[PDB]
Amino acid sequence: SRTFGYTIKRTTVKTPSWAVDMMRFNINDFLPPGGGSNPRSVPFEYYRIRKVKVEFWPCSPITQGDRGVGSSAVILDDNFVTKATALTYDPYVNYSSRHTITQPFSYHSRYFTPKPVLDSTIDYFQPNNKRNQLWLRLQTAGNVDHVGLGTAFENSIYDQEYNIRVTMYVQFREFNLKDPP
Amino acid sequence: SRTFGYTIKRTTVKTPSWAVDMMRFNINDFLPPGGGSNPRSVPFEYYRIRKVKVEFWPCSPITQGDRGVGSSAVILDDNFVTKATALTYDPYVNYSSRHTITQPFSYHSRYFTPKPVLDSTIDYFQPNNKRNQLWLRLQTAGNVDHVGLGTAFENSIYDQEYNIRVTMYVQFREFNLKDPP
Amino acid sequence: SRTFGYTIKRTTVKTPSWAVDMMRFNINDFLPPGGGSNPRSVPFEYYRIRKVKVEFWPCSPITQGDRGVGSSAVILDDNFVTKATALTYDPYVNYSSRHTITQPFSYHSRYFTPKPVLDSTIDYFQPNNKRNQLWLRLQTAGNVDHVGLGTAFENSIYDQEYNIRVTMYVQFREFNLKDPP
Amino acid sequence: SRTFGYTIKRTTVKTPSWAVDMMRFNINDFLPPGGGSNPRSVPFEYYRIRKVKVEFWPCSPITQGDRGVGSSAVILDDNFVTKATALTYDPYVNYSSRHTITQPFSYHSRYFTPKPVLDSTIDYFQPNNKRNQLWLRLQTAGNVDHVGLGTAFENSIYDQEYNIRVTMYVQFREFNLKDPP
Amino acid sequence: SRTFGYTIKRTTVKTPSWAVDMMRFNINDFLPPGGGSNPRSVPFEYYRIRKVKVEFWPCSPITQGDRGVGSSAVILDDNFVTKATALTYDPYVNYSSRHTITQPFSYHSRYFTPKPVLDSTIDYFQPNNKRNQLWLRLQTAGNVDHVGLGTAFENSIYDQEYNIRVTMYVQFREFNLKDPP
Amino acid sequence: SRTFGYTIKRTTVKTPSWAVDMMRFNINDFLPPGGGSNPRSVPFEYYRIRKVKVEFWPCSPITQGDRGVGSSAVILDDNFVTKATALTYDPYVNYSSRHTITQPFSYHSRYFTPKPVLDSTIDYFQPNNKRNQLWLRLQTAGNVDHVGLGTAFENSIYDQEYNIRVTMYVQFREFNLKDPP
């Protein structure tokens, strides 16, 4: 439920090279600190996540050409590729649940479900849309970081400024409020 | 969802005189201050109230006699009687929806629904258990005060100390959270 | 399947302050060491836990007054509140699956299902009453500690001594016995 | 669930003489000592026995000849014959529930139910496979000895070495565990 | 999908002592390194395991005697027994899902499903044959080690050489290929 | 599953002349070299091709005029026309399964199935969408070249830059992996 500026730097190379990026989810950013006997603005003992209606709302006009195509392959098992300002290939082009990345003015969105990362070394995760979703706990500091979607915009001569937006849905349960004197 | 000490001072008079009291409800006491872009610990635009399972949990043992009887007449239209340390009558004895006040160790509770007080001079209120319940708004300072139950414990030679408890139920709707940088 | 003395120290403060406590479950305490080729008194390769019929059997007589009220909120995600000899509020009063803590002579009990704590920093757990209960293993030393119930008795002038009792149910399977010469 | 070496000494006599043996069952051998407040590795107040899938797993190869034949007559009433290194007859050949003893490499097994021996002089026993099976008690020292199967291998010029194995099934009930401090 | 030489050293002791072993599974051994933009010979984002048709194909002829018997108990919770060149007992003889170990020329096999080991200290695992199987990820270096079957061959005077073979089944899904210039 | 730059050089001629091109398919380009005992990144003994969702994703903006029209006639029997920088006719205009080539910003795509070319002189091919599809074999060097779609963009005064993209679907079968030491 936030936005941030992610401008892709142009390149002079003639070959249409890609520029992979990264988008790590974080629940702490979707809630500011609290006060008194309630450090968290949303007090709850347990909470779950169903889906996240992600969307990469563009900002360039329709007159700007340099339109390309890509493949926003979903990522969850934690295994991003080495970042490069001008990649000479598209590693996310070969995938089952792929999606054509229409740019620039063309609207594009995705839908999936993220899961927490237990250990940074082994990196575990639960299946998608299932009743066996491992519950979590509320924490303002020691909080993990969920994996987002794998973007891959194609470079061009002109600049590019996007406005990524996410709507992390939450299903809180078993509230725990404190009303001191 | 809180408690407070309300000890009834004994009296030397032989006639069993009563001692009316007052219990004004307040939603601000059921939530502490917030912080940052969320002054309230419970962010929501609208909320309603259904019922309040009030209960006057006693604290005296069974060996302590001086047991009497009263009538906890419900009050909502705002019209309490003049407080008196030793009232020579029970004005709440004559009522339709009365309830035998069994004291001391005997457990006693009530169930009703409160409503906000628009003006202190005219004092308006909505009907009980109906779909036409006028909604309210969240406010940490400028908040009204709902009317509670009309208590009336009978005096005695020995002291008395109760532990009043209320479970003000709330039905929030249309959340409004703020997640600044 | 054991008991221990947990006496709540009295206080002179007039305001009815609470005194939160802690009850951490441990399977190693429910079985002493073994001998020979069977260090464990109950040999089994796998075992599960369904429910634990907890109960806080009191010990004070009925003649002792100072009766109060509380709320035994269930805890499993590991997030106890800072211990205090005389807390000026009840953080467990606001909860969904709450339970009125009737004291002293009044009997009170609860029923829930515990789960193991994988990591001490993230703290994970499985859902309640489900076929996806993650199995465990038998170990006399390297054993985790399950989370218990969240108690919250109210202070008083007179002393207080309870006799907590638990019946941790186990469902062993796939025995592994050793019968050396 | 144990094994032991029972080698039959060869003989020079030309006549094919038999060599009866003995196999007394014992529950104490199927469980080592305990420790602390649990001297027995398997704590239980009552236990029963249904069947024992006995088997005499051989060890000689198929190239070794000198194959004979016998009759493994069941024994339970306690009445073994005088042991002899080279018996000139087969007393177990005449029986109702007999079984051809195929040796050496040929596999052979039997199935019966043992019963405890009350007195050593009278020697009593209960019927086979019936609901009136007299229950027993757990004891690490003062334990009786059940009667096994009546073996009768035929002598030969070459040596012989078998690997007897028994799977004494148990049906424990009414556990009695101790969890001291 | 590999084989290795595991010869059991003979012993001079007369008592038939066992010799427990260990067999740890590893997915890295079932795939060699890659090259270029595909370090793994089998590119896939997610993969699962159903069953592993293990088999201990012997190599000794039928003329070799010294045949015994054992019990290949399944192991998954990580709890192997101390290795011994000549164990005076069989700890895997008492088990529910046991299997008679017929040696030498006699063929023997087993069927089960392994699971990954999250932590070496606590050692967790998922249930057998269930839809809640926790998925994994592809990794050529930082890869865990699954638990195999618990073998227990009996010693003998003559040597012994087996040819263990496994067919670790895999159900890859969501391919991720890279085809750079 | 790749992209390449194919810019059509402008022309000064007033008559709207066409500029035919060529697009030869190759499976070797959709897979990089391997290593060790797996020269191919995708090991499989047999594989087939169903369809190829071709698409000529444009890159010019909508403000750029000079829009024309053509006919992307399918080609498979190997019989391209002589290339010309400015053809004074459209040989692909007369066809049964034709398709209006809408340019520039207008999206256009096609769908068909290619087949291998046995000999370069006779040039054979199999029917479309049929169960009699002749299978092939995996090869990194000696691999044939399939025929693509017949493009025919109309010239113009302004430049033109398209981003051709193809998704060659494959249906591998009968895997053949090698896991040496």
Author numbering:
A (entry chain D), B (entry chain C), C (entry chain K), D (entry chain L), E (entry chain M), F (entry chain N): 50 to 230
Provide passages from the article that reported this PDB entry:
Notably, PCV2 capsid protein (233/234 amino acids) encoded by the open reading frame 2 (ORF2) of PCV2 is capable of self-assembly into VLP and resembling the icosahedral morphology of the native PCV2 virions. The PCV2 capsid protein is the only protein responsible for PCV2 capsid formation and the dominant immunogenic host response. In literature, the crystal structure of in vitro assembled PCV2 VLP derived from N-terminally truncated PCV2 capsid protein was determined at 2.3 Å resolution, whereas the cryo-EM structures of in vitro assembled full-length PCV2 VLP was determined at 9.6 Å resolution. These structures show that PCV2 VLPs are assembled from 60 copies of PCV2 capsid proteins with the icosahedral symmetry and several exposed loops located on the viral surface, which may serve as the immunodominant epitopes eliciting neutralization antibodies.
Roughly 9,600 particles were used for 3D reconstruction, which reveals a typical PCV2 viral capsid structure at 4.12Å resolution with an icosahedral T = 1 symmetry comprising 60 capsid protein subunits. The local resolution distribution was assessed by Resmap/Chimera, showing significant resolution variation ranging from 5~6.0Å on the outer surface and inner concave regions to 3.5~4.0Å at β-strand barrel regions. In our cryo-EM structure, the density of each capsid subunit is clearly visible even at r.m.s.d = 4.1 Å, showing a typical circovirus capsid protein fold consisting of eight β-strands joined by several loops located on the surface of the particle. By contrast, some surface loops, such as BC-loop (58KRTTVKTPS66) and CD-loop (79FLPPGGGSNPRSVPEE94), are relatively difficult to trace and build due to the weak densities, suggesting the structural flexibility of these exposed surface loops. The N-terminal fragments, such as fragments 15PRSHLGQILRRRP27 and 33RHRYRWRRKN42 surrounding the N-terminal NLS region, are clearly visible on our cryo-EM density map contoured at level of 3.6 e/Å3 (r.m.s.d = 3.60 Å.), suggesting the relative structural rigidity of these N-terminal fragments. In our cryo-EM structure, Arginine-rich residues (15PRSHLGQILRRRP27) next to NLS-A reach into the adjacent capsid protein located within PCV2 VLP chamber, and interact with its NLS-B fragment (33RHRYRWRRKNG43) to stabilize the VLP formation.
